[PDB]
Symmetry: C3
Subunit: 340 residues, 3 copies
């Protein structure tokens, strides 16, 4: 949906309206993702202008609006800016941009973020390199310098964000990524490291002086089938919670496995199967604990370019004896999607 | 104001800027609607796409922005999402949609919601069936199945919304509506019932286990004159306040009368007269009390399709001895409207 | 970027994405403007319709979105409506509008508000006549009545805004402005006076019963050079802070000097030099104190109509012995700008 393309600047305003309802037992106190109305809406703009033949300029913004709130004092719950960045792009040297963007481990973790509603549990927001972080300076090179094509690599720097809370805070850091596609396949390497703030060190769960994250994945996005497998590891950069002690902090070391498989049909139904197991290792008091564990059967039906429905059915395999109390119940998600 | 109609999807972005100032005595502590600056602004999008000849898809979102706030810590006061929904529509069977939409009693109560600023006092927001409620699943049939035209009927289901406050909360419920227009006239039937939450039961004002609402109205929207009369009743679903006790809750039974009359001229001035009397019956301690009571003379001048002014003058007839302290003073509202 | 111009109504949606990073020593506790990520984004619409040949109608809205926040509970920090107003315009008598707009001293103080990021320190928001105030009723005349052109004058009325805080509050007031441009030059007179609220009187810093502001400036915006000089004075209308006592209030009398100089080149780099000195006189306990004091060297490079970069380097000349603890450190600002 492009609205203004006149001089050298093309501007498209994009948004979506999603009507969701979650299905769980109880009130969602022991469940994955909860229970009840969780509808929302999105709105943002993407910009692109040509300064000359080679150097271009771009910027993007995106917002999250929530419809499951009331019209009272609880109106802005989960209303937030997902993207806010701007930068330039030259021909062969690459592109620099700055603002609120993703991390460089999301190049690996984004391969299994293809489910209807859930999935991409390892891609936590404000988790130093795996989600949308405010204050990132990213340099991306698409095809090496024109030397070979289908060989992506990027380099990121992270700015110091000392907030009031310890879950969203981070410090200075450096990351990088290497990707390669050929014959419809795909392989991604990614690694990032950042130094912690003193508010994050004083938390009871987790102790350390540097937060390291890495991941590597594969891909078979060709011939209407999708297959991917991400394996990653994380030191001092995983947000955990202890509901038995009411103490929150980070995990010392965490190992993550994600799988996904999809098939697209000609009329437009897309079945999906997925498996995710994230295990936190050597946390204080507990030992080895499993954070995320589910099988998944779901399906997405695409009516056209703009209208869609999806059903997403979580089979939680946490064995209801978790020492962190992560919540172990099955969840069904049924949604209706319009976008432009 | 439609901006993008290219492939099968027409998207129009709509908004308005309203500059309001209320006129009352004192600070609005004993007044209807208050005193001072109450300007605001709206913004949203409406979407419509054709999947094929018969099945279409649609979605809508709307936001309220407030200009009477400052640029300090009180910025988002009364900033909220009014509409957020999405659904499909087939040819003869009807249309299903889900999200944040109106209720099915608003088909009756919307006939007298035609004033410049005020009016539609019975149409409270988050009052189970008479305003915009988040989590509604509505099925609407326009003309019966093509069998007769000018015969509307709808069926709604309400989802359980157990919030932190008791005024916005609700439970599961079922409602329905029947409408009929012929020869420019109109007649609407509407009824809805929902079961209360346990936070609503523990409130001191009002006690009960089910919230029932119904209304029925008439219409003469033809030949540039407007005439309508809504009569409705409500059991356990009316938000009241006791300023003498500082206790808030619901009313046991409430009976509501609304009248309106308008005339449009060729140059564009629209005078208005209205009468609203809402009476709460058998509340604890008080007995029978009158919540809403006013005469009204107002006028709206339309410059063109987009620019307008209106004056709206409340003659409050609450006799300054109300046992709930509802506020009994006259209020003038003067506004300037731009929209697109 | 105009999107809808069809019937008589032209509507343009405008926004920008700015990626900023501030450079200071420490955490910005003794600095001008702070330290760290300060990126943001803007979005709004401007409207214009012709009712007939002479009378037109217009309205505008603008919002501030902040990207330096997280996606947690601190999401809406500094998110606010900058503009919200609407009104009409006739041919020769002028134009009336109402809502949230600027003040009439901003006609004088806006001449030196031409820096890349900083500058316009005297133009405080919600400071009765020098910033964007909610509840203003402004009448502006462009060229006198068609009698002479290049002679602007305006008259403003201020409504009573009794808020919860004393910094954003104000009372009823009257202001006016006179401007004159000829041969590329410019000269502006401006004055405004308003009566204080009782919450503003009870504050320890500053005491008085009326807030008076005035300013007068010059201009040489011709032949690609810019030169301007604003001198203004202010009685009982300047927000000050005492970090040594943790007491906040207003200043009794304040005198302000602003200078600016710019040069535009053909390829698009714009160097800038500026000098601002604001001095508060006869405050309680301190005496005469200097609030704002800096030299400035900065530059803005315009790539095209839509893409730009700027560097802005504060040379703070507060002598680190200020009795109010205003903060005395140098600050560099580096930004990347996209707009449409």
């Amino acid at each position: 949906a492009e609205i203004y393309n006149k001089d050298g600047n093309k501007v498209d305003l994009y948004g979506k309206a999603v009507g969701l309802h979650y299905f769980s037992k109880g009130n969602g106190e022991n469940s994955y993702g909860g229970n009840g109305d969780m509808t929302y809406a999105r709105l943002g703009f993407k910009g692109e202008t040509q300064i000359n033949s080679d150097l271009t300029g771009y910027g993007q913004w995106e917002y999250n609006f929530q419809g499951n709130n009331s019209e009272g004092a609880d109106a802005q719950t989960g209303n937030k800016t997902r993207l806010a960045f701007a930068g330039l792009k030259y021909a062969d040297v690459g592109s620099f941009d700055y603002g609120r963007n993703y991390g460089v481990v999301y190049d690996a973790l984004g391969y299994t973020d293809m489910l209807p509603e859930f999935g991409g549990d390892t891609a936590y927001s404000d988790d130093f390199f795996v989600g949308r972080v405010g204050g990132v300076a990213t340099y991306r090179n698409s095809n090496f310098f024109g030397l070979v094509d289908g060989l992506n690599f990027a380099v990121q720097y992270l700015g110091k964000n000392e907030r009031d809370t310890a879950r969203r805070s981070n410090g200075d850091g450096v990351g990088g990524s290497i990707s390669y596609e050929y014959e419809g396949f795909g392989i991604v390497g990614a690694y990032g490291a950042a130094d912690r703030t003193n508010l994050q060190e004083a938390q009871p769960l987790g102790n350390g002086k540097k937060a390291e994250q890495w991941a590597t994945g594969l891909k078979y996005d060709a011939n209407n089938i999708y297959l991917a497998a991400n394996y990653g590891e994380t030191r001092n950069a995983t947000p955990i919670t202890n509901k038995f002690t009411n103490t929150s902090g980070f995990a010392n070391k965490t190992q993550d496995v994600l799988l996904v498989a999809q098939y697209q049909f000609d009329f437009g139904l897309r079945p999906s199967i997925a498996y995710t197991k994230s295990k936190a290792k050597d946390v204080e008091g507990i030992g080895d604990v499993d954070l995320v564990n589910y099988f998944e059967v779901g399906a997405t039906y695409y009516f056209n370019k703009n209208m869609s429905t999806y059903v997403d059915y979580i089979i939680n395999q946490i064995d209801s004896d978790n020492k962190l109390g992560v919540g172990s119940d099955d969840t069904v998600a049924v949604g209706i999607v319009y976008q432009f």
